[PDB]
Symmetry: D2
Subunit: 113 residues, 4 copies
């Protein structure tokens, strides 16, 4: 599990559940190629995206479908999505945490061995 | 302004208006002595708390009354308030801005310190 | 100013100065068309990106070049940049401020929207 | 485990390890009485602070010794500490997460069953 994404709701003080997350890798032609995706769990976490063998060095984009999240709660959101773009370098485990509000998002990386 | 507070509302995407702020200074005796107070304006800013002469060295507490803010809006939040405690002016006079971002279950504060 | 960006540095407790910002608008064709660009001033603010007339309805991307900022300071950060994508002016003209707080391994953005 | 505290370093992208945390409960005379304390673990988490039986409704203060944390890293910090003050109400598990930078701290609550 070199990559885990966790999503939090700052309005309700809870995990953000059933949030779609899409991971892309940057290809040599600068396009974004699908890499991994899923929906956050009841704990707001998304496990099992990738394996060490697949997760090579490069530039990755994590897109979080925050607009659907908010609209399903009957709340009009500001952003079209939340995006986090980063280079993976060879400590080895990346946790991407995002904290969501209708008009704000924050993202932090915790990178450990 | 040697001491300013600015507050944003991350739910409404607006300044956080009419937020009460109480400032305290730790006294000789190690209690919190009231120092100044005010509330944020339509721009979410609070100016005119103090003066260069009055804002001497010390340990200051900026209490941001986030609970009353969310409750005045008829919303039930997590925290009682936001407290920001720092030593000020120990290397000569500086200008301090306390910036805060509020959500019902989260807040954040950052300090901008200028000479 | 219909569109403004302000950026703070949570490490130094200062405005984030000389941060490059590129704005894009999604085009007819579904690509990102360059729209405007600038860099933050000594106050960490970026004014004069656009005009009311030019800032029509659309989907806008504000790219904040945080990597170049941390690297110009000789520091190695996590993110490539900060991207902020939103639909603007779909209910008539508004004024948008994109506020960001930066640390090497974390950033945060909030929008203040006024009428 | 009705109360867990987690502390993150936004400068290094890591758990904030060996950070002292003190919990107090507000007494009827408005003083703060010691309640629980410890140091964050290698994951930046502090488990086992209290039990359901001890953790009654009331106002609690969590104080995080951020100044020592920064100074031990050779960094001059802005705040004297980070503090989080909240009322416990009868969902039942509170996670207090704090993200630290020299001149900033953020705190979020995740409150689940
Ligand atoms: O258990 C876990 O795995 C876990 C759970 C939760 C975790 C966290 C913890 C903390 C997190 O995020 C908070 C984020 C960063 C700080 C806050 C937000 O942003 C701003 C704050 C203040 C701002 N003010 C400002 C800036 C410039 C100009 C003007 C202003 C103003 O007027 O207020 C602007 C933006 C996210 C996730 C981490 C780990």
């Amino acid at each position: 599990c070199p990559l885990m994404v966790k999503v939090l709701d700052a309005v309700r003080g809870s995990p953000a559940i059933n949030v779609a997350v899409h991971v892309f890798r940057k290809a040599a032609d600068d396009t974004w190629e699908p890499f991994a995706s899923g929906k956050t769990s009841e704990s707001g976490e998304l496990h099992g995206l990738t394996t060490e063998e697949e997760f090579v060095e490069g530039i990755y984009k994590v897109e979080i479908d925050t607009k659907s999240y908010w609209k399903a709660l009957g709340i009009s959101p500001f952003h079209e999505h939340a995006e986090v773009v980063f280079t993976a370098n060879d400590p080895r485990r990346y946790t991407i945490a995002a904290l969501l509000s209708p008009y704000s998002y924050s993202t932090t990386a915790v990178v450990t061995n």
